[PDB]
Every structure is written in C-alpha cells, then in structure tokens.
Amino acid sequence: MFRNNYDGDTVTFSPTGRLFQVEYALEAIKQGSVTVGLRSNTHAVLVALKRNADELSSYQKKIIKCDEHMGLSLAGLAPDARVLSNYLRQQCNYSSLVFNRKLAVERAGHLLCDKAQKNTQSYGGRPYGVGLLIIGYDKSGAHLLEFQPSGNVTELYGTAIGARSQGAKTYLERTLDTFIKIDGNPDELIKAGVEAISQSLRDESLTVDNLSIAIVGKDTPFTIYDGEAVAKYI
Amino acid sequence: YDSRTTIFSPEGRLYQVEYALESISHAGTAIGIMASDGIVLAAERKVTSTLLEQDTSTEKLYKLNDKIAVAVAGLTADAEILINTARIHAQNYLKTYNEDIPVEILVRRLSDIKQGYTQHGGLRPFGVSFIYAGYDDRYGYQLYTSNPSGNYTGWKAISVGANTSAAQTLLQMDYKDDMKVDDAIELALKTLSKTTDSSALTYDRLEFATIRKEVYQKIFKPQEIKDILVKTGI
Amino acid sequence: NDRHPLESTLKNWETTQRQRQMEQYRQIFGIAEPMKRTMEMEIVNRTDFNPLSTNGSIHRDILLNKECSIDWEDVYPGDDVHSKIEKQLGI
Amino acid sequence: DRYSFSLTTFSPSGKLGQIDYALTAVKQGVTSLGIKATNGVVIATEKKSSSPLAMSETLSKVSLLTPDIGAVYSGMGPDYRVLVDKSRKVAHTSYKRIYGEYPPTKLLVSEVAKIMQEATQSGGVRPFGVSLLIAGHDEFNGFSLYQVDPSGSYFPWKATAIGKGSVAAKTFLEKRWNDELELEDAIHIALLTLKESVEGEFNGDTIELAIIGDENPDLLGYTGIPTDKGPRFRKLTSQEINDRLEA
Amino acid sequence: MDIILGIRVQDSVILASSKDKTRQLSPHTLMSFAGEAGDTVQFAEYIQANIQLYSIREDYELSPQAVSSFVRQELAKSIRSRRPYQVNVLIGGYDKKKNKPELYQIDYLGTKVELPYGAHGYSGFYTFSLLDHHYRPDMTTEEGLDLLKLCVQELEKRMPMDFKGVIVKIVDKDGIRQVDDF
Amino acid sequence: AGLSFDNYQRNNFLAENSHTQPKATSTGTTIVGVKFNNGVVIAADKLHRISPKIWCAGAGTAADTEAVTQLIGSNIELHSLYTSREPRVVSALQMLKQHLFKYQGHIGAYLIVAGVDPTGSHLFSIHAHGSTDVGYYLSLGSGSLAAMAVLESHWKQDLTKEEAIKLASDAIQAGNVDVCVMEIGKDAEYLRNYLTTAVLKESIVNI
Amino acid sequence: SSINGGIVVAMTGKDCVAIACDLFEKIFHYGHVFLGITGLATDVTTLNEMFRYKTNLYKLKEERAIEPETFTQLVSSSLYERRFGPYFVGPVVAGINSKSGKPFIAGFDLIGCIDEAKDFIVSGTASDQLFGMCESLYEPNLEPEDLFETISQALLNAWGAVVYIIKKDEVVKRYL
Amino acid sequence: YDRALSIFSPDGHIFQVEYALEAVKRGTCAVGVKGKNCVVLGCERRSTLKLQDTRITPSKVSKIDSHVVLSFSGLNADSRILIEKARVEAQSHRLTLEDPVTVEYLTRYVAGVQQRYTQSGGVRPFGVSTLIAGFDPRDDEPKLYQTEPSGIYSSWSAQTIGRNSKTVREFLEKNYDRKEPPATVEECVKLTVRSLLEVVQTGAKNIEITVVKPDSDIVALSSEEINQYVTQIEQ
Amino acid sequence: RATSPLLESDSIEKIVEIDRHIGCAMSGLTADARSMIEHARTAAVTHNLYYDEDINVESLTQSVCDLALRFGEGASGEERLMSRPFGVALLIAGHDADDGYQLF
Secondary structure (H helix, E strand, O other), X not given: OHHHHOOOOOOOOOOOOOOHHHHHHHHHHHHOXXXXXXXXXXXXXXXXXXXXXXXXXXXXXXXXXXXXXEEEEEEEOHHHHHHHHHHHHHHHHHHHHHOOOOOOHHHHHHHHHHHHHXXXXXXXXXXXOEEEEEEEEEOOEEEEEEEOOOOOEEEOOEEEEOOOHHHHHHHHHHHHHHHHHHOOOHHHXXXXXXXXXXXOOOOOOOOOOOEEEEEEEOOOOOEEEOHHHHHHHX | OOOOXXXXXXXXXXXXXXXXXXXXXXXXXXXXXXXXXXXXXXXXXXXXXXXXXXXXXXXXXXXXXXXXXXXXXXXXXXXXXXXXXXXXXXXXXXXXXXOOOOHHHHHHHHHHHHHHHOOEOOOXXXXXXXXXXXXOOOOOOEEEEEXXXXXXXXXXXXXXXXXXXXXXXXXXXXXXXXXXXXXXXXXXXXXXHHHOOOOOOOHHHEEEEEEEOXXXXXXXXXXXXXXXXXXXXX | XXXXXXXXXXXXXXXXXXXXXHHHHHHHHOOHHHHHHXXXXXXXXXXXXXXXXXXXXXXXXXXXXXXXOOOHHHHOXXXXXXXXXXXXXXX | OOOOOOOOOEOOOOOEHHHXXXXXXXXXXXXXXXXXXXXXXXXXXXXXXXXXXXXXXXXXXXXXXXXXXXXXXXXXHHHHHHHHXXXXXXXXXXXXXXXXXXXXXXXXXXXXXXXXXXXXXXXXXXXXXXXXXXXXXXXXXXXXXXXXXXXXXXXXEOEEEEOOOHHHHHHHHHHHOOOOOOHHHHHHHHHHHHHHHOOOOOOOOOEEEEEEOOOOHHHOOEEOXXXXXXXXXXXXXXXXXHHHHHO | OOOEXXXXXXXXXXXXXXXXXXXXXXXXEEEEEEEOOOHHHHHHHHHHHHHHXXXXXXXXXXXXXXXXXXXXXXXXXXXXXXXXXXXXXXXXXXXXXXXXXXXXXXXXXXXXXXXXXXXXXXXXXXXXXXXXXXXXXXXXXXXXXXXHHHHHHHHHHHOOOOOOOEEEEEEEOOEEEEEOXX | OOOOOOOHHHHHHHHHOOOOOOOOOOOOOOEEEEEXXXXXEEEEOOEEEEEOOEEEEEEEOHXXXXXXXXXXXXXXXXXXXHHXXXXXXXXXXXXXXXXXXXXXXXXXXXXXXXXXXXXXEEEEEEOHHHOEEEOOEEEEOOOHHHHHHHHHHHOOOOOOHXXXXXXXXXXXXXOOXXXXXXXXXXXXXXXXXXXXXXXXXXXXXXX | OXXXXXXXXXXXXXXXXXXXXXXXXXXXXXXXXXXXXXXXXXXXXXXXXXXXXXXHHHHHHHOOOOOHHHHHHHHHHHHHOOOOOOOOEOOEXXXXXOOOOOEEEEEOOOOOOOEEOOOEEEEOOOHHHHHHHHHOOOOOOOOHHHHHHHHHHHHHOOOOEEEEEEOOOOXXXXXX | OOOOOOOOOOOOOOHHHHHHHHHHOOOOOEEEEXXXXXXXXXEEOOOOOOOEOOOOOOOOOEEEEOXXXXXXXXXXXXXXXXXXXXXXXXXXXHHHOOOOOOHHHHHHHHHHHHHHXXXXXXXXXXXXXXXXXXXXXXXXXXXXXXXXXXOOEEEEOEEEEOOOHHHHHHHHHHHOOOOOOOOOHHHHHHHHHHHHHOOOXXXXXXXXXXXXXXXXXXXXXXXXXXXXXXXXXXX | OOOOOOEOHXXXXXXXEOOOOXXXXXXXXXXXXXXXXXXXXXXXXXXXXXXXXXXXXXXXXXXXXXXXXXXXXXXXXOXXXXXXXXXXXXEEEEEEOOOEEEEO
C-alpha cells in the first residue's frame, strides 16, 4: 500500500525508517538457485546447483575462479553477477601485478563491498542483485566470506544463499560442530557440503550435469569439479 | 503531453510547438508585401503609451545586413538573440565567400536554429516568427516567413500576428503582382488600418520599413511615417 | 618542437589551476569540500545548455570567484546547433 | 542526467507561466521610477528597510554600471545584484577593452537583456525576478532611460514607474511630464511622484535618488590630461536629498 | 617537374599543367595547383568536397570570385598552425552571373590576385619573357591556345630535361572542356 | 581563446626566409619612482592609468606594458565597484605579479606601480616572470642606473612635494619628461611635458 | 613578387585629411574611417576582411557609423590579439570625427601600439627616408588641394599611386 | 509508458516512437517506384495558396548527390536538417574515399542518425520517414530504401508514406507485378501518376515528379499534365 | 515476415554473417540488432587482425552480450551506454576446432 509511494527509487527513505529499494535487491537473491559453502581449517569448499533454461540448453556457470588461491560462487542477477565477477578478477590481477602480492580474501571482500555500496547512494544507479560466496585460502588460513548486495560482508564457517537455502543453512547449523573438524580430509568435507545442499531440493535430484563443486586449500589450488568428476561425491 | 517538448502526443502532434504558434497570435500584426520593384515591411507595435520614446524604440523591426531586413512578432527578448545570430552568420558568410549572403541561406540557418531549440529538452521553442525581406542575384526580391516550428515558406504578400486571418484575406483580395513600392505601401497601410483594434491607427502605433531600387534599405522615422499616412489619407 | 613554448601550459591553464586549488582544499578541508565544490561545478555545467550564446553561464563566474575579474581568455573569445546538441548529450 | 527539461514552457493559452509569475513578483516589489529630462535623467526608489536598525548606506539600491550609466530595480534584490555584477563585467570585457571606450546605454541594455533572456529558456534556472531602469548618457544618443523586464524585453521611455506604485506613479507622470523639462525640475517631479507611493517616513534615508547630469571633474579623481571626462553618474546624498525635498 | 600556366582571354580561361594536378569544382569553375605531393592534393580534394557540398546545398554553382575567396580563406586556416608546406594554386572559371571569365592566383602564404596570366615553379620567370610581349586581354580563345603552345615551346627551349607535355583544360560558357594533348 | 598562437609557425618560417619581421615599439630609456613624506611621484621619459590614484610606468615593449596595465586597470575598476571601496596598490601588485607570472615573462613588461590608498602611499616594481621588489626609490630601464645614482646621492626622508618633483626630474634627465604626483587625500596630477608629372585620374567613392 | 611592402602615407591639414598609397589597393574604408595597410598580402587581405566584418557588426548594432578614434582603438586591440603571432602589418588609419569634427590620424606597430600623430604618418619600406622627405616637405593647416599636392609630391619624392582626399561630407579618390 | 523513450510498453512496444511514426502520417503523401532501370518519385505538394511564391523552394524531393535522391513526409523542419546531415556525410565519404556513397550506405547512415536521436530521452526523434533512392555508383541496379523514426529501414520495389498512405499502398500492391515491373520511364511515370491520383483529388498542379536514372542523371518533370490526361483518357 | 509483396524479400537480412565460420540469426527490433551485429563483426575482425587466428564462438558471444549488458554498468566498469536494454535477441551459430559446431 504505502510502500508503493516510497519504493520508486534508491534515494527516498520511507517514514517507517526503511529503504525499500535495496530491500527488493536483497530479496532478489531468493530467485536464484541454492549455493552452499563451508569452511575447514585446511580446506574450504563450495557446492552449487546449476540451473538451465530447458532440457535443450547447457547449464550455467555458478562458480568462477579468480586465482589459484580463491574463487567465488553467486546467485541472483546474471548481469550484476558478471559485472562483479569481472571487477573482482580485474582487481585481483591488479593487486597481483602492482604489488606482486596475492589479494587477501578479506581485502577483496571489503574492496568489493565498497563498490556495491556506492550504487545505493546515487540516483539512477540501482543496487546490485547478486549474492555471492567468496572463498579462498592464503597466509591467514581458509576463509569463506558471504556477500550481500547491500555492502554487508561477513566471514562464516559455512552458509547457503539462494532459493530454499534456509534448509541447507539449518543443516549447517546442526553440523557446525562436526564439519569444521573434518579438516584434513577433502573428500569428507565435500561430502558434507553436498549433503548440506541436498536438503535444499524439493523437485530435482543432484546429477553430474547440474551439480558443481569447487575446493581450495593449502595443498589444493582452487579447482572446479563438474560433469562426470562429481559423480563420486553425489 | 506538454510538460516536455521532446515527446509526441498519441495523435502524432507536438503541443508545445502549437502553444508557441498560439503565442505569436497575441503579438502585434506584422505584414509584408513584395512589389515588382521592391519590398515593403509594416508593423503595428502592440506596446504603446504616450510616454514611450517612439523616436528611437524601433524594436518591432530589425536590420540584418545591407539589403536584408526582417519584421518580428512575439517576444522581443527571443527576437534579439536570433537577430544577433543572423547578423553574425551573414557577416561571417560575407567574410568567407566575399559575397553578400543570399537571403534564402540565411533563412535556412535561422529556421534550423529555431527547429533546434524545439529538439533539445532543456530548450523551449522560440516564441517568435519573422518576415524576411531582401535582395539577391539568385531571385531578386522575395519574402520569407518562418514559424517557431523551424519551417519557412516563400510568399508574395503575408501577414503575421494578431488577426492574421483578416489581413491575409484582405491581401489575397487586393494584391496584384505588378504593383510598385509606392502602391504596395498604400496596400499595406490600408490592411493594417483595417486589421487594427485601434480607431484610426495613428502614426505612433506604427513601425515601418522598405527595400527598393545598388539597393537602398530605409526604415522610416515617425515624422515621415505620419507624412506617408496622411499621403495615403487614412 | 614546432609549437610555441608557452602554448602547452597556457592552453589548459584554468582547468589545471582549478585542479590544483581543489587538491589544496582537499589537503586542508578534507574530502567533503572538494566533493561539494566539484559537484556544484558539474551540476551547473550539466544543466546549462544554450548553444547560441558561447558567452557562458553567470553562475560559473560566481562559483569560480571571477565575477569581478577579466582575463585575456575572456576579452578575446560543424558549428550548427544540432552538432552542439550531439556533442553536449554525447548521444 | 546530461539534460534538464526547460523550467519555462508555454501554457495552453500561449503565455509563459514563469515569465508572468516573475512579472507579478516585480509588481509586488517596491516602487522605483525614472524621468528623462532635456539635459539629464533622474532615477529614484524607496529603501525597503527591514527595521530602523539597518544602515541606509549599505542598501545601495541604485548602483552605477559605468561612469555614464546608472541602474535601479524593483523586485528580487539579490538577482539584481548578481545581474549588475555580470553587467559591469560585460560592459568592460565585451566593449571597453575592444573599442577602448565605455559602451553606450543601448548596447549595454541589449547585453543585459541577453543575460535575462537566456535565463528564460534553460534547463536549470528560473527567470530573474527583477525589472531594471537603466538611465545613462551616450556621446551620440544623448540621455536615455531604458527599462528591461524579466523576460529580457526592453524598450525606452521618457518616464516610468515599476513595482507596487507602478500604475499611480505612471499615470501621474503622464500628466506632469513635458518636453522642455530641466533636470532641476525632473528631480522635483520625481520626488513629488515618489511621495505618492512612500508611506511612513519620507526623507533622505528612505529614498535613494541618482541623476545622470553634466560631467563632474571633481569626482574624476585625477587632474591634467583634460581629454578624460568626469563621470556623469552622480548619487545624491541624504543631506542633499533633504534639501531638495524641503522646498 | 610540376608547373602550371594559366591565361585569361576575352572568351575563356585556359589552364595547363604537367601530369592530374587539376580538380573540377563546379560546371564552370576548375582549380589547378602545384606543390609537394600529398599535402597539396589533400587540400585540393578537400576544397573540391566543400565546394561541391555548397553547390548541392544551394543547388546553384558558385562564382569563380567567391570560390577564390573561399580557397584563400581555407588556405589561411590550414596554414594557421603548421609549416606553410609550399602550396600554389590557380583558379579559373566562367563567371556566368556576370558573363566574364576570371582567373585568380593564390600562393602558399594565402594571398590572391586577379592575374590576367600566371604561373608557378620554373614558369614563373620564363614564359614571362613571351607573355610580356604577346599577351593581350582582347584575343580570342584560339589565339590564347596558340600563345600557350608558344609558351610551352619556350619551356622546351629552356629545359634540356625531357619535358613530359602538359594537359590543357579550357573553360567557357559550355563549362570545363578537355583538349587533347597539344 | 585568449592571445591565440595561430601564426607562430608561419612567423618562424617567414623569418627564416627573406621576409623581415617588423619591429615592436620600445618604451624609452629610464623610469623612476620616488616616495616622499605625503605622496609618491612616478616619472618617465608614456604613463599608464590603472586607477584614478594608481599609476604605472612601463619599460620594455610598449604594446605589452599598455595592454597588461590597462587590463588590470579595468579589473581593479570592477573590483572597486564590487567592494564599493577605494582600491589599494598592494592588490594591483598582487594581480600584476600573478599575471606576468602566468605568461612566464613572454609578456615583456618591467613596470613601476605607485599610488596612494587608505593605508598611505605605496611604491613597488615588477620585473618579468613576477620578480618583484619594494623600496623608497626605484628605477627601471636602460638608463635607470644613472637615475638611481642620483637618487641615493640625493634622496632623504621627509622631503616634500616640490623636492620630490625636482629629484624625480633630475634623476630622469640624468639618464621630453612627464611626471605624475600622487598626494594622500588629493587627486593625482599628471604633468605632461614637464621638461605635368601629376597625371591625374579622379573619382568619388561612396561614404 | 613585387606586391608586398607598399608604402602608405597619411597627412592632415585644415578641415581635411589625406591618405595615399604607393601601389590591388592597400587603402580601405569602413563608414568614413580610412585604413591604409602595409605588409604581406595575406595579412593585409585578412585584416581587411576581419575589420569589414567587425565594423559592419558595430554599425548594425549601433545604427551609427564608427568614428576614427573608436576604430583606432578597435584596430589596436585586434592587432594585440595574436600578440605571440603578430600580423606582418604597419597599418595607418585616418578619418574625420563626425561629432567633434576634428581630423584624426594614427599609426601602429605590428602589435598595435598606437603611435598617434596629427601632422603626418608614414609606414612601410623606406619609412625613414619618407619621414625625412615629408618633414622637410610638410607644413600644417594646408588647404585640401594644397594637401593633395603635398602628399602626391611626398610619394613622388620616395608606377601606380592612389590618394584619398577626405572632407567633412565628401571624399575624392584620385589616381596618379 | 508513452511518457518517455526509454521504457518498453508491457506488450513490447515503445509507444513514444510509435507516436512519432504516427506523426509521420501527418505530412503529405510521397511515393516511389522502381522501374527496370529508372526510379520515379512523386510528391503531393500541399495545395498552394495563390500568395505563395511558386518560383522558390517548390520541391520537397531534394538531392543528396549527383546519383542519389531523397524524399520524405512528416515534419518538414526535421527533414531539412536530416537532409543536410545526409549531404554532409555524402561529401565526407567522397573525401575520405575515392568512390561516392552507395545508396545502401547512405540510407544506413540516415537510419543511424535517426536511431541515434532516439538513443537518449533528451532529444525528440525526427517525425520523418525518408525514401532515399538512386543508383549505385557506376552500377545500373536501381535502389530504393525507406527509413523510419525508429531507424528501421528496408528496400522496396514501391512504397508510400504520409497522408492517406494506405490507399496508395494498396493500389500499388494490386497493380505492381514484380514478375514484370514497368520497364520504360513512361510506364513507371504513368504508374506513379495513377497511384497518386487515388489520393490527390486536385489536378496535376499538386503532383510533383522526380526521375532519377543511372550514371548520375536526375531530372524533375513539368509535363506530367500530359500523363495525367492520358490516365484520364484511360479512366 | 514480408509485410507486403512490394518489399524486397531478398533484401531483409534476418540472417547475417559475422565471420567465415561464424554467423547468426536475429529477431526483434532490428534497429538495435544492427548495432549488435556491427559490434560483433568489429570484434571478430579486430581479434583476427591482432591474434592472426580465428575467433572462438564463445568469446564472440561473450563480447556481444557485453554490449547487450550496457543498459547498466559494463562488464569492465564502463559507464551505461543507453537508457534501455536491447529489444533484440539472437542465436549465434559457428564452428571452432576446440568446440565443434555449436549454437549460442
């Protein structure tokens, strides 16, 4: 009702003290498919479910590597996902060249949240509609930074974003005491991650063509599994 | 569909330009006639008071270049800038090609200018319309008229401004192509006298100009205007 | 080498001078003051389109604090209106 | 965002909303009038003092644009002040330093009308809410008294009155003005006319009056090289205003 | 070698040059030029483009005098910020409005003169030893062509180099006309 | 915009060729400015007006000294009408130094500026590229050295207007003479010059 | 080419001014102020066109012909433009002020420093010899015909020469 | 949705550009026909008031080069400027490249210009639809293209624009056989005259005709009164 | 989609070539598609010029969609180019030795 009088643009607040336009951007994540990530001292793993338009089409790239030490998964708007992924890759390369130093995970997270926030302050530009999980390993150990389009970034042992992600988040809440201690056994950690996403499905089953897994660690450079490779983890 | 000049209405018409066409209809009548041997411009000045300095006002007619003169209707402020641009363009053409500007090329330039301000949203249409008169080897004497829409048309005898329909009818009834300047003057004065809302149209209400016979362009001061008005015996 | 020595520096004197002034203001008054001043300048230039009068905006003079000063660049100041519309809108 | 829709647009009746509203704002402004005499011009206005604590001196409503030209207004004062600053800068840069002499009233009035006009049709500026009486002397045209409206329309006069007292003062001038007025009678007529619109105190601190008369070498500031003529603009002091008013 | 000669006569304007070097500007006006390759021809075709643009816009050819003024102005504009690069031009045509043929010379600095006859290069001082005597503004076009033939004969006399033979272009009330080599 | 360089290459090419560059006008030999107890006197072998009581004498190129001085005179006129108060010399000096620095001395002006303002009398000097100096007595130009010698051999504190004029004229002539005197609280005074073959064919051309 | 460097001389007497040229004329007029120019052909032609443009604009804006002193200031200001790229010109201006009625003459340098005088002015090649032969040959307050004789003799004592005699309301061109 | 250029209608339209195209219907009728080797353009000149000066600015059909012709309907003021830009482009191409503009290239440029004036909401799109026609340089194939305010352009054997367009287009659809297009100039001119006569009730004084032929030949007729009579005899 | 028989059915290209091995078919408001095809051809020719090798179809598709992305911020931080997205959709077809015949 009255919401329709104040959600017209990113600038106008509402008398309740809310900002509906970026709230809609946050809600946009619910349309995207579930993507899950989890942390262990030696390894941090991503698990994502790819959606395809129709049986005639190929499956989408839910996971993008940025460097041999980090990468990210995403859900929500395709254009914003592309923009943010390319910007982050560009800045990672910029850091690696200008400073000869691998871009720190937290540094990248804040560097990207600053970009995401600025669009919420100026008229015309719209808030980004892509939630993404940045995962990487560096000198400071394994990290997994949940990202939200409203500049909010936090380090989590694990999480799920996208449609029906709350079930996977509940399973992760119930197994946090367990899967963290699985450090030193990447197969078991990936199995736990997959068992987390399985709770998010209501219609379709995990299969070598839709599921896709990425892992990174001290002994494992950021690697992406897909196709027949993920059969043993299903 | 009139707050913006850049948008067509569903009927495929511009309301903003049509309003400007309405505006000039409020301004004082300006009338021009082409004779076999010269052109005559007459103009009834809308603004009038016993205190106004008729001897030097001459804001109803303007000179652009030797052998080119224009009568204007509408806003004097809008008229002034276009007149200045026309003078600059004519003198620039003279400087470049070392020949006097053919009046058609001048009218083309000013018509494009007036159209242009109908184009950019931050610019309103010029609320003025000009009667052009001049001499050139291309076609001799010729009268051109241009509206806020940015179009132009050639004429033998035309009227502009308030009650333009009545003056046009009178001209269409009385005009002949073999007339000479000294008789075109009588025709124009008669038309203005029968078009005005004044009782007798005394010399104060009237501003006048003519081009005749290499070619002498003369704008009459009020004394000779009265002399001519009594010569024709209004 | 073929140009007059003073040409390169004088060509853009006003803009480089303003940039240096804004740099000094940022050093002294923080990021906020240059932001405000540059945004004033851009919001004045953006909204003022008038191809016929190259004379320039009055408020531009007001904001540069040159409303009471004269420079040789002021004494001695494809050209159709539509070309100006294209150039200004970048369309 | 690279364009702004014009603030001024035609009403369906062919009029301009902002120009008419600006003219109305001029009407509500305080009275100001000027008279062209045979050998001089007089321009006067009332000071709209907020309270008797205001210094009359700083309310310099009349101000000279050149040693030959003086301007007075009615309506939105700050607009007039900024416009006078721009007009003086134009009078110097555009005309003097090119032709080496101060511009005549006609050309300067045209330039100021140009400034006012471009404001009438723009994407981010409203028309100026003032109308200026611009008296002055020209080496050829002689004494002249031009009026300029918010829209930029300008046209000369022998006498005028703009603002709150416009109609009554204009009708009074229409009956009192005559052809062979000497400046010392033009000042008298202006003071008598302004008395009709002034309410409350009417003395040298409430009316600002300036006259464009003969050369005043006393105001030139330097002597020798008599080729340079003294300024013609001359503001009258409060004491002299009281003296002229007393009779 | 690059040289141009031009002779105005009571009925026509005769232009000749060593081989090209010539561009038509309108049905009754044409231009011939010399100078270093590339820059001069670039300027010549730019002038042709502008003049044809004006002709199409007004749908009316332009008088030779106006074309000469335009060419001088544009040369002064081009030389505004670069080395003069030594271009020389001749402009001839039939001023159909005033019914008189006119020939104009323009030099690299940007001057213009209504020469009865002119030249550039080697022919600026030789063939004047003959023009000074044989020339008159009253002769017919054929006499002008014969005079040009004698001028090129004099050029051959002065030049041991194997002269290539100039092309001859004439302009009359009929418009620009090419004449077979002679 | 501004002082266009739109012929520099052409001028260089012409100079390389036989076409001789016409020479610019000079500005005499000597200039002096002498401050005295109640005013300052500026003398030259023409003077340039910046403001009624601000005066300048310019060595070097006459065209440049005229142009820059007159431009800053107009600008100070705008300033004075802007702040509605008397202009003061130090503002003129700041403007001149900034201006001649902006053009890096390619504007060939060596100016002496003197005037009286609500702060009293002032006297200064501006070289090219902004090199400025102040002093009780100054001199510029080729003949300035002898005029100086005279000045420091004669100048003293508290001397009056007549002695100031005498000293200024003597210093100039030690190098006609026109001198300008500024008195605090009074108008500046400009003292100019103080020291059958005709074979005919006729026609009328229209005005 | 022989076309550059032509002499120009200006002289004033009783109630008239005489401006003459040693020859494509080099003396040009706008309204009633006459401008003689010496220098490169390109510069004289370009200055002619530019000054015609500016003076015509001034005439149209004022509805009044431009007076010789105002024109003098205009030409000085124009020549100062391109101060770093000056024209190769030595122009000379002459005319009769309409209102005050005093004859006027003024010279210039290539940058526009007004070298005003009211006895005579010369510019161009052999300027020194011409100045000497005019000073030894000039007298003030001459009648218009005597002024014409004097200026013609001065040029002859330096073919093609054009001399303008300018009155209050009439100007007589003459070729020698 | 109709308030601006930048927003699609829910069904996929852009109502503002469609309104501009409708405004193109306001102007007088113009038609073009491709013959076997000649192209004929006819235009319904607005009935001239007897006070108009017939000897000046009579033609809407105008030239863009020695071998190209442009005709239009709609807002005349916009059309003049579009023609001016087309001429500028044609001469710029002749300068930068030795070969003149291909008719396809010129119509592509005009379509781009019209489209570019629609890319941003700050500018009104031209209320005009040009009918560029001509022959490609040194090539005998006739070409005829139509442009629209949206920038969409297409080549036609025959096409009509402007006031009462549908009546003419239907008539051409029936009477023009692509298997045997009118070969000789006379037949094409007669077809054009018949087509316009279905709209212009007024006599031949209203119908202007332009004939463009290969090898850079353009001519405007003043004898179609005979053609009008012949169609009258056939009627 | 010949609206009338008078239109030249042979001169309305809903199918076009981008490179020797790469072409595409389009639908929608052809005005935007003209710019899209021109950009695709420019990218292909520039790639062949710079790298002296055939353009991979996936790279061309990414480049084209990048232009289509410009209603907002570009894939490399470029400012918005237009007020509206393209009203055009197309399917690219081509062959690459590393991908075989494929349709995007």
